[PDB]
Amino acid sequence: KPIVFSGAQPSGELTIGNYMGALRQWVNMQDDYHCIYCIVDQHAITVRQDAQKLRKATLDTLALYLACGIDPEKSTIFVQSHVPEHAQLGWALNCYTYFGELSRMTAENINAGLFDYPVLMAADILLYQTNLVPVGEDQKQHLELSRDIAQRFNALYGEIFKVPEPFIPKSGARVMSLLEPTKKMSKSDDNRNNVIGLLEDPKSVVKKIKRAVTDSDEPPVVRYDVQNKAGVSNLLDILSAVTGQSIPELEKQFEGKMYGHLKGEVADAVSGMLTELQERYHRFRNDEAFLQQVMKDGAEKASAHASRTLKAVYEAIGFVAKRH
Amino acid sequence: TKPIVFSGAQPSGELTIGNYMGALRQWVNMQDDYHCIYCIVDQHAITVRQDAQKLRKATLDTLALYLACGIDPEKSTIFVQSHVPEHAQLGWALNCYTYFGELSRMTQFKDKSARYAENINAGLFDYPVLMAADILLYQTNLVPVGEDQKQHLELSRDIAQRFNALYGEIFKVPEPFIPKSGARVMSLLEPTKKMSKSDDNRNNVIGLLEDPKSVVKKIKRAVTDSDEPPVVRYDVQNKAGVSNLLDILSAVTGQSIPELEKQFEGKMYGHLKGEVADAVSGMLTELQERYHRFRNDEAFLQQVMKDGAEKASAHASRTLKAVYEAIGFVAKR
Ligand SMILES: Nc1ncnc2c1ncn2[C@@H]1O[C@H](COP(=O)(O)OC(=O)[C@@H](N)Cc2c[nH]c3ccccc23)[C@@H](O)[C@H]1O
Ligand SMILES: N[C@@H](Cc1c[nH]c2ccccc12)C(=O)O
Numbered sequence: 025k026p027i028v029f030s031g032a033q034p035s036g037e038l039t040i041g042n043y044m045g046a047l048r049q050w051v052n053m054q055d056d057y058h059c060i061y062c063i064v065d066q067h068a069i070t071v072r073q074d075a076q077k078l079r080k081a082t083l084d085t086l087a088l089y090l091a092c093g094i095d096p097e098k099s100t101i102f103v104q105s106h107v108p109e110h111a112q113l114g115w116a117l118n119c120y121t122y123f124g125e126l127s128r129m130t131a132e133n134i135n136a137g138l139f140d141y142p143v144l145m146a147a148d149i150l151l152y153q154t155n156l157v158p159v160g161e162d163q164k165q166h167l168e169l170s171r172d173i174a175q176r177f178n179a180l181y182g183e184i185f186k187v188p189e190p191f192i193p194k195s196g197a198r199v200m201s202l203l204e205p206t207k208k209m210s211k212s213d214d215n216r217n218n219v220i221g222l223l224e225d226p227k228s229v230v231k232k233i234k235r236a237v238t239d240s241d242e243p244p245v246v247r248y249d250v251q252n253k254a255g256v257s258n259l260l261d262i263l264s265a266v267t268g269q270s271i272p273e274l275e276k277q278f279e280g281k282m283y284g285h286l287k288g289e290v291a292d293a294v295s296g297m298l299t300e301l302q303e304r305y306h307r308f309r310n311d312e313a314f315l316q317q318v319m320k321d322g323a324e325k326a327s328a329h330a331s332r333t334l335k336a337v338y339e340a341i342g343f344v345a346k347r348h
Numbered sequence: 349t350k351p352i353v354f355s356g357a358q359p360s361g362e363l364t365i366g367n368y369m370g371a372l373r374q375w376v377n378m379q380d381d382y383h384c385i386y387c388i389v390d391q392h393a394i395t396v397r398q399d400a401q402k403l404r405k406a407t408l409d410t411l412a413l414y415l416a417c418g419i420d421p422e423k424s425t426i427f428v429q430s431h432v433p434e435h436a437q438l439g440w441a442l443n444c445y446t447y448f449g450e451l452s453r454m455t456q457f458k459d460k461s462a463r464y465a466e467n468i469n470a471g472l473f474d475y476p477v478l479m480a481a482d483i484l485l486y487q488t489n490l491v492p493v494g495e496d497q498k499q500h501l502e503l504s505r506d507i508a509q510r511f512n513a514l515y516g517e518i519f520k521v522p523e524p525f526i527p528k529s530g531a532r533v534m535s536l537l538e539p540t541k542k543m544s545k546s547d548d549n550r551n552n553v554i555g556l557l558e559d560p561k562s563v564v565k566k567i568k569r570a571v572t573d574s575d576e577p578p579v580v581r582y583d584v585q586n587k588a589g590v591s592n593l594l595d596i597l598s599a600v601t602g603q604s605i606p607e608l609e610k611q612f613e614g615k616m617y618g619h620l621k622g623e624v625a626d627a628v629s630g631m632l633t634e635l636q637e638r639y640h641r642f643r644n645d646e647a648f649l650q651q652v653m654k655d656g657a658e659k660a661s662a663h664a665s666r667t668l669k670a671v672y673e674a675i676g677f678v679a680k681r
Contacts, residue, residue: 065677069444075515075676082678105672106680108433115436115478119394119471126470132449136477137440139448143470144440181400320681338430342400343390344407346431347654
């Protein structure tokens with residue numbers, strides 16, 4: 025199988041956009057690819073934050089990914105800091121990365137971790153002979169750097185690394201912000217009323233969906249039109265993504281119906297989806313023995329592959345081999 | 349337990365009399381008085397592009413040179429940097445508590461960038477943070493280095509204090525141990541420039557593994573000054589070459605500059621250079637004699653690296669565990 029690598033931020037608070045788009049897509053392709061999920065706690069500390077919240081957030085992220093359907097028997101899921109090889113290769117690749125490349129990444133008070141993390145990201149990918157990396161637009165420059173580092177290192181020492189590719193085909197589900205249906209729903213939003221988080225209760229979902237922007241059409245008509253009726257179209261897309269019903273099916277279902285009925289059905293459908301997900305989440309999250317065993321097994325698998333690459337990197341560079 | 353000494357040297361170029369006087373001399377003398385840990389910093393060496401065969405050979409050369417200088421593996425921990433993963437691990441973590449402006453202002457980064465304009469890499473920029481990690485891993489009290497590493501060590505102190513201020517008594521704040529004489533041995537044909545272990549002009553340098561006969565000839569050709577009459581006197585501004593020769597003689601013999609100045613009253617630069625040549629040539633002959641016994645004994649060099657890496661890993665893992673707990677990582681099972 026081709027190897028897929030994804031880096032999951034611990035501090036992230038996932039939305040229905042994250043789940044119904046990319047994550048649900050990838051949960052169903054775990055037998056097609058050798059999928060690797062790395063909870064990137066070493067990347068997280070580039071932003072200063074409360075230590076106890078970071079530890080909590082790492083375990084929250086682990087349980088949530090497991091709740092979404094990531095299978096630790098099929099996929100490799102692990103914590104970044106538990107595999108030393110990431111930091112080790114990170115340093116090695118610094119010496120084959122131009123300062124210029126990092127300065128040009130899209131002043132004196134910035135920490136060196138924030139300046140240097142694209143090299144650690146390159147190490148995260150290249151450690152596991154990664155074939156494919158599913159990235160968003162804002163991470164595309166970083167993937168290109170990892171491809172450039174890999175080719176540069178390979179040209180000097182032979183084919184040590186696989187040159188990774190972006191995972192091109194996009195999810196399918198379109199989830200836009202509730203008060204700004206032109207902008208995509210993103211976990212990074214400051215206006216929380218634009219998003220619906222995966223751990224939101226049914227009362228919170230009703231509140232946010234009720235407030236969601238629609239249009240001033242008279243009569244109100246539930247029809248799909250991203251240009252003229254962005255808000256109503258987003259509500260249809262969300263409902264479609266949840267239930268699997270096509271857009272023209274929903275358009276027929278809501279014939280002669282106001283936006284109040286649509287919003288009611290959207291809220292009900294999303295919370296129906298989020299309840300089964302939350303059940304799994306809280307069950308996994310409160311079982312510390314389960315989470316510890318997943319992290320141990322995951323790190324053991326990751327380390328097996330990671331150490332083989334780093335050995336070849338170290339041999340190529342010419343370091344004296346460690347005496348075990 | 350004794351206070352801890354930590355220091356390192358790169359397996360790149362060929363270590364000089366400068367590297368000896370500024371660092372290695374002090375390393376040997378500190379072994380009983382303090383708990384000493386010495387490192388061959390191969391991860392730092394690759395910030396300048398190395399040939400793979402040259403790096404491997406130079407790592408083992410440097411190890412053998414420590415042993416030849418008198419670094420006893422029964423007294424001190426001797427290890428290769430890349431053999432202990434914790435250096436790279438704490439190296440990354442400390443990037444997040446190091447400012448960009450601190451690294452860009454570094455003299456060594458600027459000097460090396462001008463020299464290797466075709467390879468101004470991120471490793472060369474990030475050099476001080478990994479160096480800080482090297483020191484802070486072992487609860488280090490003293491760091492014996494030459495004058496040129498003063499700025500790097502000052503940042504290690506700032507990082508340690510900055511980290512401790514947030515999280516508690518995780519690191520010891522290290523102190524420099526820079527010698528009185530021989531802290532910055534200067535180049536023989538350019539006494540205003542520091543002696544480099546990778547100088548393009550070999551006549552500037554006294555290599556520790558260089559033929560003594562070649563070294564004596566280099567001392568004879570070292571530039572002095574136009575003073576009439578010639579006078580053996582210490583004056584860095586006006587008599588840089590003579591002052592550098594006196595500094596080298598002082599560091600090798602243990603005699604003070606005023607003691608040597610009095611000794612060379614009524615003498616000129618022939619006497620000075622004769623004494624410097626005799627003292628240095630005698631030192632290098634003995635050193636090189638021990639070196640080949642160590643360097644050609646691969647089984648012994650392998651055992652030193654194994655034992656040393658094991659001892660270092662025990663200290664390093666303890667510190668990294670505490671660092672990781674403090675910043676809020678989930679602890680490894
Ligand atoms: N002309 C000279 N005169 C007197 N002393 C000199 C001269 N040139 C060099 N030195 C000193 O030799 C030591 C090794 O230098 P390196 O370039 O190998 O290597 C260096 O410059 C360090 N960054 C290696 C290192 C890495 N991590 C560490 C942690 C603690 C101490 C040292 C290190 C140094 O002490 C240096 O000050
Ligand atoms: N930089 C990514 C996280 C990440 C770290 N390493 C990666 C490797 C591949 C993909 C993603 C990652 C983010 O901020 O979202």
